[PDB]
Structure formats: C-alpha cells, structure tokens
Amino acid sequence: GSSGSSGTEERLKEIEAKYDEIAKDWPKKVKHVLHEEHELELTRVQVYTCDKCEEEGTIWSYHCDECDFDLHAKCALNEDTKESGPSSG
C-alpha cells in the first residue's frame, strides 16, 4: 500500500549539517580573555547577547557549563581585534 504522514518540529537533521560546515574549523573549547578562567564550549544557540562586542549571535555561541558565559564564534577565536593587534616593539 501507500500512505502519508505529517511532520513535527525538533527534527532538524539536514539543517544541523549545514551549520557544522560553517564551524568545521571552529574549536570545541575556546579560551576567551574575559572568561580566561575557563574555556567556553561552542554551544548551539538560536539567539543570545555577546558580552564582549555587545552583539547577538545565531546558531552558534560559546557557552560555559560552569559560569554560563556566552560569546561569539569569531570573538572567541580572536583575542585582540578591537583597536590594536599583535605587534613587537
């Protein structure tokens, strides 16, 4: 025979794969400066508020299961990219 069925939420299988491709190089644990104490853990988040650059990330946010610190994928990756950079002298 042949019959049809309906669909439900919380079943994002393909979608997830997409994001992963974006964070293929992105590390699982980052060592931020403001939270140097511990290394955040890239946690999947729909929306949040970065406590570094004062922005809002999506489908990506460095969360810590110890202090609950959220950050941006890029913000965490980089160290000092606000005004100055790596220079010797």
Smallest gap from residue 20 Cβ to Zn ion (A) = 21
The alpha helices in 1-53, defined as continuous H runs, are: 14-22
Structure tokens at 84: 């100055």
Q: Which is nearer to Zn ion, 18 or 58 (CB)?
A: 58
Smallest gap from residue 75 Cβ to Zn ion (A) = 4
Structure tokens at 42: 């890239």
Smallest gap from residue 35 Cβ to Zn ion (A) = 6
Q: Identify residues 22-81 at the interface with Zn ion (CB under 5 A).
A: 38, 50, 52-53, 55, 64, 66-67, 72, 75
Q: How far are the Cα atoms of 5, 8, 49 from residue 2, in angstroms, in the given order?
A: 10, 20, 48
Cα separation, 83 vs 80, whole angstroms: 8
Interface ranges with Zn ion (CB under 5 A): 38, 50, 52-53, 55, 64, 66-67, 72, 75
